[PDB]
Amino acid sequence: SGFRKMAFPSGKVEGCMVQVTCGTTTLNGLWLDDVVYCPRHVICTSEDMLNPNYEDLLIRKSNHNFLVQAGNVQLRVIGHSMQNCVLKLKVDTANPKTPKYKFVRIQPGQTFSVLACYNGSPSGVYQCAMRPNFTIKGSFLNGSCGSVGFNIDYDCVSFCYMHHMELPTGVHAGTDLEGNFYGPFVDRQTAQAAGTDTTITVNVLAWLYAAVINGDRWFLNRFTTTLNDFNLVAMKYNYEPLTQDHVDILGPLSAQTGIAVLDMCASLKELLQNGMNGRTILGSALLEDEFTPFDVVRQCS
Amino acid sequence: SGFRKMAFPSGKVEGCMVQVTCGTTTLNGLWLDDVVYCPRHVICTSEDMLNPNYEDLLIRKSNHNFLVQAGNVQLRVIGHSMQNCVLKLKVDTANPKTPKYKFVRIQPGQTFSVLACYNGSPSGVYQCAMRPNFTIKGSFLNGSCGSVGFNIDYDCVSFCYMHHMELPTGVHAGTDLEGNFYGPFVDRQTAQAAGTDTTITVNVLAWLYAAVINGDRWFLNRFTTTLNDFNLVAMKYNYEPLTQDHVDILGPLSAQTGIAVLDMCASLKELLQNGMNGRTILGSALLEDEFTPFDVVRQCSGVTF
Ligand SMILES: O=C1N[C@]2(CCOc3ccc(Cl)cc32)C(=O)N1c1cncc2ccccc12
Numbered sequence: 001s002g003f004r005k006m007a008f009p010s011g012k013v014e015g016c017m018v019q020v021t022c023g024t025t026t027l028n029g030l031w032l033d034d035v036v037y038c039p040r041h042v043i044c045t046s047e048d049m050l051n052p053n054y055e056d057l058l059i060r061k062s063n064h065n066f067l068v069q070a071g072n073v074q075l076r077v078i079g080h081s082m083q084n085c086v087l088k089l090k091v092d093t094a095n096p097k098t099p100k101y102k103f104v105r106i107q108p109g110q111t112f113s114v115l116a117c118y119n120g121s122p123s124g125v126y127q128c129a130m131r132p133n134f135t136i137k138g139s140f141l142n143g144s145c146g147s148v149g150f151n152i153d154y155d156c157v158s159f160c161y162m163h164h165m166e167l168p169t170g171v172h173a174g175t176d177l178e179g180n181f182y183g184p185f186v187d188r189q190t191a192q193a194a195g196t197d198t199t200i201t202v203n204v205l206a207w208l209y210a211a212v213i214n215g216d217r218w219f220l221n222r223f224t225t226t227l228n229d230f231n232l233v234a235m236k237y238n239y240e241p242l243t244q245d246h247v248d249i250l251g252p253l254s255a256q257t258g259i260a261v262l263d264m265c266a267s268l269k270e271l272l273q274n275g276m277n278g279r280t281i282l283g284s285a286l287l288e289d290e291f292t293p294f295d296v297v298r299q300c301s
Numbered sequence: 302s303g304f305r306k307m308a309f310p311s312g313k314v315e316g317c318m319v320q321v322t323c324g325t326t327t328l329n330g331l332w333l334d335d336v337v338y339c340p341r342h343v344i345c346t347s348e349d350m351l352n353p354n355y356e357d358l359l360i361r362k363s364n365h366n367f368l369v370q371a372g373n374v375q376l377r378v379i380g381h382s383m384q385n386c387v388l389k390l391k392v393d394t395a396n397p398k399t400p401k402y403k404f405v406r407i408q409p410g411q412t413f414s415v416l417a418c419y420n421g422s423p424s425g426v427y428q429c430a431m432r433p434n435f436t437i438k439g440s441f442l443n444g445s446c447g448s449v450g451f452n453i454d455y456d457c458v459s460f461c462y463m464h465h466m467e468l469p470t471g472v473h474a475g476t477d478l479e480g481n482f483y484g485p486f487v488d489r490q491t492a493q494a495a496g497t498d499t500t501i502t503v504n505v506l507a508w509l510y511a512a513v514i515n516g517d518r519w520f521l522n523r524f525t526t527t528l529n530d531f532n533l534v535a536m537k538y539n540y541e542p543l544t545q546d547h548v549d550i551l552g553p554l555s556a557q558t559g560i561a562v563l564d565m566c567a568s569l570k571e572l573l574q575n576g577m578n579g580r581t582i583l584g585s586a587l588l589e590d591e592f593t594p595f596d597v598v599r600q601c602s603g604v605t606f
C-alpha cells in the first residue's frame with residue numbers, strides 16, 4: 001500500500017554522466033559506449049546567443065577543443081558530429097559502466113525520471129511528465145544542460161530526454177537523444193513561450209484508479225457519461241481530450257477495480273465541478289496528472 | 302527554477318542490494334563489506350510471526366539456511382548474529398561496490414531517500430520524511446522488507462532506515478541500521494497503530510522559503526509574530542512546536558529571501574486560519590512538510606554527489 005511519486009533507480013545513468021567543456025561553457029554529457037552525447041549549445045559564445053549557426057561553429061572546432069571529464073579522468077575526443085540539436089563526441093574509451101540502453105522519443109503525458117547534474121556530477125533524481133505543451137516542469141539551475149530523462153525496463157535504460165533550456169515561465173524544454181526538440185522550441189535565445197498547458201486527463205483517471213486500489217472511494221458516484229459529454233466538460237477545465245486509446249489503456253485498472261472508465265470519468269467530472277471540499281485523494285488536494293496508467297499498475301502490483 | 306520532491310542519486314545504494322532467503326521468506330538485504338544486513342523476521346514461519354522468540358528461531362538456523370544472492374551470484378554465509386530487529390549475515394566476500402558509509406539514526410522531520418527493492422532488485426527511489434509519529438508514508442508492497450532509507454553527505458552514504466512492515470492505515474514502519482525501531486512498534490504480526498500525526502512546522506517554513514525563491518509571494522504579508530504566539534496557533538492545527546533551533550536553522554533562507562523567520566511564521570499563521578483561497582504554492586494546494594531547510598538549500602543551489 002501507499003502511493004508515491006517514484007523515480008527509477010538512477011545508478012545505471014549516474015555511471016554515464018560526464019562533464020563537457022567548450023571554452024567558457026561547461027555542461028553535462030551522456031557517455032554511452034565510445035560516444036558522449038551533449039546539447040550542441042555547448043559550442044556557443046556570447047555573440048551566438050540569438051542566431052547561432054551551429055554548422056559554422058562546429059566546423060571551426062577541433063577534437064582538442066572539447067574537454068570531456070569522466071570523474072577525475074579526462075577523456076580524449078577523437079571525433080565530433082552533430083545530429084539535430086545534439087553534439088556527439090567520439091571518445092577513445094568505451095564507458096565500462098554502459099548499461100543496456102535504447103533511445104526512445106516519448107509522447108505528451110508520458111513520465112520519466114530526471115537525473116539532475118551539474119559539472120558531470122549527479123545531484124538529484126525526480127519524476128517528471130512530458131506536458132501536453134511539450135515542456136517539462138523540472139527543477140533545473142544554470143549548469144544542468146545535458147541532464148537526462150529516462151525510464152528503466154527490467155535492466156534496460158530508455159533515454160528519452162536531454163535538458164537544453166528554461167523558458168521565461170520557469171518550465172523546461174529539451175530534446176530526445178537524437179537531438180529533436182519536444183515542442184516548437186529551438187536552441188536559440190530568441191523569444192519563445194510555452195503554449196497554454198492542460199491537464200493530462202488519462203493520467204488523472206489512472207491516479208483515481210490508484211486511489212481506489214488504495215481504499216479511497218469518497219469521490220466515486222453512481223453516474224456514468226458518454227465519452228463526448230466528458231470531453232465537453234473536460235475542455236472547460238483545460239483538461240486534455242480523452243481518446244478511445246486512453247479508454248482502452250485504462251481497461252486493466254477498470255477490470256481490477258470494477259469501475260468502468262466512463263464511470264470513473266463521471267467521478268472526475270464531479271470533482272472538477274465541486275472541488276475536494278477539504279478532502280484529499282492519496283494525500284493530495286489537487287488532481288495529480290504525472291502518473292500514467294502504466295506507472296499505476298507497476299507501483300500497485 | 303523549479304521545485305521537485307527529489308531523492309539522492311541511488312547508485313551507491315543499488316550496488317549494495319541483495320536477496321535474502323530463509324525457507325519460505327524472501328526479502329532484501331544490504332551488503333556492506335563482508336556483512337549482509339536484513340530484518341530479523343526473515344527467519345519467521347506463520348505461528349512464529351504471531352509471537353516470535355527470535356533468539357530461539359535463530360539458534361535453530363545454520364549458515365546454509367540463508368540463501369544470499371547478489372545479482373546472479375550466490376554469496377556464502379559464514380556467520381549469523383542478531384542486533385535488535387536486524388539480522389547480520391557474515392559472508393565470505395566483501396562487497397566490492399561498498400561505498401563510504403555510516404549508520405545514522407534520524408529524528409522526526411528529517412527526510413531521506415528510499416530505494417524500494419523486491420527480490421534484491423531496486424525498482425524505485427523516492428524521497429520521504431520521518432513523520433513526528435515515527436512512521437513513513439512510503440510506497441511498499443509485499444517483498445519490500447529490507448529496502449533502505451539513506452542520505453548522502455559529500456561522498457558518504459548515511460543509512461538511516463530499513464523497512465520492516467506496513468501498519469493498518471497503509472503507513473510504514475522500520476528501524477535504523479542497528480535494528481532499533483523508529484516508533485513504538487514491534488516486528489510481530491499483532492495489533493499496532495500509528496499515533497495521530499502532526500505537521501512538520503520547520504519543513505513547511507523551509508518550503509515557503511523555497512516558494513519565495515521560485516517567485517511565489519502571494520502568501521507573504523507585512524506581519525510578524527512572537528515564537529510564543531506562533532506555537533499557540535501551531536498546536537491548535539496539529540503542527541509540531543517550532544523551536545529556537547528551528548529558527549536558527551532557517552537563518553540562511555531568511556537572509557537569502559529577506560523574510561525573517563517570525564515574519565514567515567505570521568504568513569503560515571494566516572495560511573492556517575484562512576486557507577489558500579483557490580491558490581497554490583509550488584503547484585500544491587496543501588502545505589508541504591517533507592522538505593527540510595537543508596533540502597531547500599541543496600536544491601535551490603545545486604549541490605552534487
Ligand atoms: O544553461 C542554460 N542556457 C540557457 C540560457 C540562455 O537561454 C538559452 C537559450 C537556448 C539554450 Cl539551448 C539554452 C539557454 C538556459 O535556458 N539554460 C538553463 C537551463 N535550465 C535551467 C536554467 C535555469 C537558470 C538559468 C539557465 C538555465
Ligand SMILES: O=C1N[C@]2(CCOc3ccc(Cl)cc32)C(=O)N1c1cncc2ccccc12
Binds near residue numbers: 001442446
Ligand atoms: O513483508 C511483510 N511482512 C509483514 C506482514 C505481517 O506483519 C508484519 C509484522 C512485522 C514485520 Cl517485520 C513484517 C510484517 C508486513 O507488514 N510486510 C510488508 C511490509 N511492507 C509493506 C507490505 C505491504 C503489503 C503486505 C506486506 C507488507
